[PDB]
């Protein structure tokens, strides 16, 4: 039939384009195949006809949805899925990578024509392509609640501030460990260490907050971390051989106890 003849012709064009793309270590994308077919046959190319091909002879190709396809300076975002086509070819006994030689091209078009003849002897439904992945009483009640909550918050605000900092300590401890690994030094000053931690931390913080956090770490965990007052400055020395997982467990236990 005329429709089947067009199908066979565009199948030959698709096979030629896929062979040309694959023979040079280039991943055949749908857009390039469509562009090549449209230039070759001056006819519209669309996924419905590809699904029809897959219905006819599914063994021709493997269809996958893949990311990280470099499209040069086309402004394409990485999160854009692309439909790739991989030819299914029998592996030779010579050990070389399979290549779409003209003999294989002729074999494939002949097999497609034979399948078309068999279908006639029996429109083609396309195959499903893999898709990408009083007011006074209320006011007095509110005032009573406010007074009760105020009496509740008469507790020192610092008690909860330390608790807030306790959640931040483990990550800061890891960062401090990494800084001491990077600096190749046994002791560092407060200023440089705090500046580097602020310049590497995930949260914007003031140097004073970092100093208080370091003091809290020193007081909670003196065996790992030691502070020495020299002249007019305090220097920071740490034991690099301690296990980080055990320290994290100890910090979690301390935070639980403080709760």
């Amino acid at each position: 039939p005329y429709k089947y003849q067009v199908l066979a012709e565009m199948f030959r064009s698709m096979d030629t384009i896929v062979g040309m793309l694959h023979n040079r270590s280039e991943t055949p994308t749908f857009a390039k195949v469509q562009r090549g077919v449209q230039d070759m046959m001056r006819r519209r190319f669309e996924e419905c006809n590809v699904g029809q091909i897959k219905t006819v002879y599914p063994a021709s190709y493997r269809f996958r949805q893949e990311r990280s396809v470099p499209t040069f300076k086309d402004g394409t975002r990485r999160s854009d899925y692309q439909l790739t086509i991989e030819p299914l070819l029998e592996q030779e006994a010579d050990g070389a990578a399979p290549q779409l030689t003209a003999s294989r091209l002729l074999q494939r078009r002949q097999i497609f024509s034979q399948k078309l003849v068999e279908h006639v002897k029996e429109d083609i439904e396309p195959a499903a392509l893999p898709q990408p992945p009083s007011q006074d009483l209320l006011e007095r009640i509110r005032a009573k609640e406010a007074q009760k909550q105020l009496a509740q918050m008469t507790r020192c605000p610092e008690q909860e501030q330390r608790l807030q900092r306790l959640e931040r300590l483990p990550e800061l401890a890891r960062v401090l460990r990494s800084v001491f690994v990077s600096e190749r030094k046994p002791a560092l000053s407060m200023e440089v260490a705090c500046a580097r931690m602020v310049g590497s931390c995930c949260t914007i913080m003031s140097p004073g907050e970092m100093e208080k956090h370091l003091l809290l770490l020193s007081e909670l965990l003196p065996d790992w971390l030691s502070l020495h007052r020299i002249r007019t400055d305090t220097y920071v020395k740490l034991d690099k051989a301690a296990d980080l997982a055990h320290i994290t467990a100890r910090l979690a236990h301390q935070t639980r106890a403080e709760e």
């Binding site: 931040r168 960062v175 990077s182």
Partner: protein, 495 residues
């Protein structure tokens, strides 16, 4: 190097045992694809898997990197380049010393210049011209058919403004990108590069491997949520953002709004609608104007300050300068394009020449700048919000003349500012008392006279969280806007 072989074996161990699923199996299988030839490895996984290997790689990266590539090739062949990411330490360009040669460190900077892609020969197959002997696998110390070539890119970077010490020229560094790192960086962008500082014949050059551009803690997230439910959040933010400035809260509201900003929209016709706000302030000398500029500069990390007359047309947008080594013409960035997706503050806007304001014109509305000078044709993005400060023609606002006569600004310039405030100074006793007591209290009680409802960092976090939302306009808002604009336009500064 025996330690290099030990590192190779340990890298094989990490590749074969890291997990309950091994993360790198799928990536290694994808490395078979011809377009994929570099493997990305997290540094935190390396340090948690083992510490001696992590320290050795951090200390002798150049010594063991080819052995790492050999290990990767062996692992892939059982069923290529190695890239590392997520190093937790950030460094400054001024920190780069000779003692750090060979260390795996990551550097933060802004890309200013780029160079085209060049093929670099790694291993060359040489044919002797005397005895016709083929010499293969010859490494290069810095037959084309059988030799190996690797793509190259040259990048020139410049120090960031924030890290720049006052009175210092921002030094420039050359960056080498290979294989998948090529063309991954664009001029005018700020990037963090992971790699090493190598010694070129001497000369200092940094070799890089990678580039950089729900999970927030519970208490910070809950503090943001709780403060988002405050009914007086608007007034509290207005008071906290300017604790030391008395009155003039309308300017405070305007600058807060322009900090929030709107949404940009691009039509189906390809035309982009500006989602930013431009503000002009004109007032008598008495009223504080530069203080707002200083406050918004110190608060917003993405703010740029400049003077009026001292800035030329070339220095604002861009300039065309002939490159010494390349013997060609390049473009040097201006202030406006460095303030991309930020705020630019201009002081004494009146003193600027018209020849400069006409250059500003394009960036004001079209949000882009185009250059067609000396055979150089390009267009550049200028996505900026402009905050301008100026004074009337005479130092004193003379009421004997009309409002239009008092401002010496061109009509399109007047039109292209969204909010336009005019400040007039008056002699009132209560205002004098309030201003005097505030000034003296600040001068005598510097720290204890400040009561901030919210921390500046908290405001910054809330602003970062809020800016990514894109609200929708309702039909009630639609017809309300229609009728309000009907009434408004029915009445110098034409609407």
């Amino acid at each position: 190097d025996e330690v290099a072989e030990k590192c190779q074996k340990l890298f094989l161990d990490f590749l074969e045992e890291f997990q309950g699923e091994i993360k790198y199996l799928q990536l290694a299988e994808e490395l078979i694809r011809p377009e994929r030839n570099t493997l990305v490895v997290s540094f935190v996984d390396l340090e948690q898997f083992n510490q001696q290997l992590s320290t050795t790689i951090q200390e002798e990266f150049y010594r063991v990197y080819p052995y790492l590539c050999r290990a990767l090739k062996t692992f892939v062949k059982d069923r290529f380049y190695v890239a590392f990411q997520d190093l937790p330490t950030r460094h400054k360009i001024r920190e780069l010393t000779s003692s750090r040669i060979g260390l795996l460190t990551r550097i933060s900077g802004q890309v200013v210049r780029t160079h085209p892609v060049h093929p670099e020969l790694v291993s060359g197959t040489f044919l002797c011209l005397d005895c016709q002997t083929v010499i293969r696998d010859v490494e290069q110390q810095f037959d084309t058919n059988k030799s190996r070539f690797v793509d190259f890119q040259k990048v020139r970077i410049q120090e960031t403004q924030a890290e720049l010490p006052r009175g210092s020229i921002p030094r420039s560094l050359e960056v080498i990108l290979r294989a998948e790192a090529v063309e991954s960086a664009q001029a005018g962008d700020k990037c963090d590069f992971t790699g090493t500082l190598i010694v070129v014949p001497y000369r200092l050059v940094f070799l890089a491997c990678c580039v950089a551009p729900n999970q927030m803690t519970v208490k910070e997230w809950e503090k943001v949520f709780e403060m988002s439910q405050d009914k007086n959040l608007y007034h509290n933010l207005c008071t906290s953002l300017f604790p030391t400035i008395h009155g003039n809260d309308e300017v405070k509201r305007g600058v807060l709004l322009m900090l929030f900003g709107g949404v940009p929209k691009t039509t189906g016709e390809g035309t982009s609608l500006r989602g930013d706000i431009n503000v002009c302030i004109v007032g008598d000398p008495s009223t504080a104007k530069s203080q707002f500029l200083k406050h918004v500069e110190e608060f917003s990390p993405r703010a740029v300050y400049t003077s009026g007359k001292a800035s030329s047309a070339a220095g604002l947008t861009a300039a065309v300068v002939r490159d010494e080594e390349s013997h060609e013409f390049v473009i040097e960035a201006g202030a406006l394009m460095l303030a991309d997706n930020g705020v630019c503050c201009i002081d004494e806007f009146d003193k600027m020449d018209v020849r400069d304001q006409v250059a500003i014109h394009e960036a004001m509305e079209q949000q882009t700048i185009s250059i067609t000078k000396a055979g150089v044709k390009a267009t550049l993005n200028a996505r900026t919000s402009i905050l301008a400060a100026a004074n009337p023609i005479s130092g004193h606002y003379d009421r004997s003349k009309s409002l239009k006569q008092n401002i010496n600004l061109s009509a399109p310039i007047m039109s292209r500012f969204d909010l336009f405030f005019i400040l007039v100074d008056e002699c009132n006793e209560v205002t004098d008392y309030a201003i005097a007591r505030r000034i003296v209290d600040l001068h005598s009680r510097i720290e204890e006279s400040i009561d901030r409802v919210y921390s500046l960092d908290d405001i910054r976090r809330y602003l970062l969280f809020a800016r990514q939302f894109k609200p929708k306009i309702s039909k009630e808002s639609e017809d309300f806007i229609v009728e309000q604009y009907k009434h408004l336009r029915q009445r110098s500064w034409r609407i």
